[PDB]
Design a protein around this ligand. Structure first.
Ligand code: PLP
Ligand code: PLP
Lengths: 420, 420
């Protein structure tokens, strides 16, 4: 009678969701236009109940299904789930320190090339593994690494490049891969805000050795808290897994014969696994990713077209050459000769119920926790500093309707006095 | 039909749990006697459904309730949830590296005193922060540090002591604290397998600066995957939370005035948070903790009394002086001169459906991943090696009835020919 009880519960929740998770009609001056948010329906809540009923708890039925369907969407054979994007970035960079990679293994002291205009945990794992971060400037209005500056940052200590596809926009993969392959550097693609982004027709994350993604509520799809590491190399997939799972194996050491393999450890590991409840949510969301990716590209096009009327005061976002960005948010840099400060605009928008966000750390090297970190900067961080000082982004996620954006646009116009 | 679509779901769930989480009648030869396992029911599945329906996903309503009730049970003000017991250990040790702790902040090169007879993630955080682990031997048959050896392992570089109350049994807190307070060393109590354990009447994990616990299915209570860091210090609580939450602040750097606090980072952080779904499961479990602790003590006394008949071949476990250990498992050391191997015994019990587990890493210094790690060992690890070779544990968790245990006892007797 269980199979029944399930399907009956599946109904009771489906009708609970249609009432709860229902889109509220937009209302200027009352409704908010957040920079991001999750979009969950019946399928999400249903599967989470299914997982709750299973009583299994740790990863299993749903986690297998999720890692599989996500591997399909991405076009990669190996996908490992983890606690968050940050955790995924950590596993990705840590995995390359495995002595199983012989001479290719990252060692304390080695250098990782990246940029300072990003999210802290894109860089932290490098520091947390005793490596030295080496920064170069980014470009505006793509808000991604200025590829041309990469080559000069390469020294004999350089072992890898780890940068994110900022806000869904892709970086110059053509130039990055060129510099990577030339010097035999590892490459890690932080796609935490770029699920669905393509470059030269190929899905983001599948160009380098390892790719990461996040399932925090603000990203493309969510599990509440969750993330994933994916690769095409079986060797890396096994190393990542070991690090995630207490560092356990699957010879060295002097353990007695017959010692349980389960309790044999080959790596300096962590326990960064998730539950099947989180997996379920993720699984339902995967049924909406294609839609989500399309609505983001649309909202971006619409919004930008409309906002072109303020081009004298703000610089609008531009997708990177030869790429089709699955926009995470809408970045805007306010001109210095506009007569007002970012604070003014943000505060104005805030009062208008229009949410905004700065570009994460702005300039990592100027963040307080970077006070005593050992790092190198090649060239100047002019654009990064400009980002920290003048840049901010707004919302184009699936939860925003054309009426939402129209409102945001009129506010920008009202602000700059363009409605007169 | 909202509150009420919700009270009706709770029904179809409370009735699905009757058939699903119903204890199966013991059957010798067919039924198994695992060394550990989760004991969940109606309440657990119900709350997880509530959280699922909430549609919040990230920590919230339930996580607040859980951290609160655990703080009450433990007798501490600050409790922070995290992804696992291993993550809890990671956050506890890392937090002490915060420059906010001035002169007494762990720095790479510093030493942390611990034992080699334990679990990998109890020690890894030390290594992962660039510190140096310093080991001293343990004692049988308590299986906890030989406290009298701590003193000699202390040096000018010693800044802390991080040890776990192995298998629920408590290490010699009196001597440890004495040594800690003397040299002003930080003390971290890994209580991942000791929830409910008391020493001198005082709850385990509240004698030192930071405490950690795990919620993996094998532990006292579960969330599938999850754990918690707890302390009595508001300062440590703030440092921990920052590290758990992207290292975001709770002045230095050169950020522009008005930069979003949400994006101001004071620590080299991670993202080790869980979902409210997990929080829910844990909350339900908290009701049954007192029952569980009482039951584990019962099964221990019973099993050990019954197994006293084999005292000639195996050494039975002994609670540490002046402690009321909330047993995690039942540790047994097979005598060398018994004429057989642990391999034989395990293999025999395995066939009999009696699950066994070695004492985790046995001897960490002999594990393959420790091949190149920098560490120090004061004195010899004689008992540790003995544990690696001759020790193992079996099941006394709440999911085991007297019929389960009696069956196990008959198998031990049958093995050593005591039934004759
Ligand atoms: C969100 C994010 C992360 C990490 O993801 P979490 O799930 O928040 O831990 C890493 N890098 C970038 C660029 C991100 O936006
Ligand atoms: C289980 C355990 C841990 C870590 O807990 P997880 O939830 O498995 O990551 C740490 N120390 C000890 C002694 C443990 O038994």
């Amino acid at each position: 009678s269980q199979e029944e009880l399930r399907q009956q519960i599946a109904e009771l929740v489906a009708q609970y969701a249609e009432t709860a998770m229902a889109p509220k009609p937009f209302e200027a001056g009352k409704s908010v236009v957040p920079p991001s948010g999750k979009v969950i329906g019946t399928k999400e809540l249903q599967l989470m109940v299914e997982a709750s009923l299973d009583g299994w708890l740790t990863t299993g039925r749903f986690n297998d299904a999720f890692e599989k369907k996500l591997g399909e969407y991405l076009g990669v054979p190996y996908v490992l789930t983890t606690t968050s994007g940050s955790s995924a970035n950590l596993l990705a960079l840590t995995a390359l320190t495995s002595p199983k990679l012989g001479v290719r293994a990252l060692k304390p002291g080695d250098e990782v090339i990246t940029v300072a205009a990003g999210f802290p945990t894109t860089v932290n794992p490098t520091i947390q593994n005793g490596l030295i971060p080496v920064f170069v400037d980014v470009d505006i209005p793509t808000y991604n690494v200025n590829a041309s500056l990469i080559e000069a940052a390469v020294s004999d200590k350089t072992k890898a490049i780890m940068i994110a596809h900022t806000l869904g926009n892709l970086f110059d993969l053509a130039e990055v891969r060129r510099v990577a392959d030339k010097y035999n550097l590892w490459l890690i693609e932080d796609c935490c805000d770029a699920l669905g982004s393509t470059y030269d027709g190929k899905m983001a994350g599948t160009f380098g050795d390892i790719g990461t993604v996040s399932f925090y509520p603000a990203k493309h799809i969510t599990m509440g808290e969750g993330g994933a590491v994916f690769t095409q190399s079986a060797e890396l997939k096994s190393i990542i897994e070991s690090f995630r799972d207490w560092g356990r194996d699957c010879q060295l050491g002097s353990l007695p014969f017959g010692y349980d393999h389960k309790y044999t450890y080959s790596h300096l590991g962590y326990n960064l696994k998730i539950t099947d409840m989180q997996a379920a949510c993720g699984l339902a969301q995967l049924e909406r990713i294609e839609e989500f990716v399309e609505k983001r590209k649309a909202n971006f096009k619409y919004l930008k077209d409309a906002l072109q009327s303020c081009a004298d005061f703000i610089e609008l976002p531009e997708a990177t050459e030869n790429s089709d960005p699955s926009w995470f948010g809408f970045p805007i840099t306010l001109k210095e000769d506009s007569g007002v400060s970012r604070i003014d605009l943000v505060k104005f928008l805030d009062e208008a119920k229009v949410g905004t966000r700065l570009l994460f750390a702005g300039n990592l090297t100027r963040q307080p926790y970077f006070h005593d970190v050992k790092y190198r900067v090649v060239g100047e961080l002019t654009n990064t500093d400009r980002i920290m000082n003048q840049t901010f982004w707004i919302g184009i996620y699936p939860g925003l309707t054309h009426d939402h954006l129209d409102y945001v646009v009129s506010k920008f116009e009202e602000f700059f006095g363009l409605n007169f």
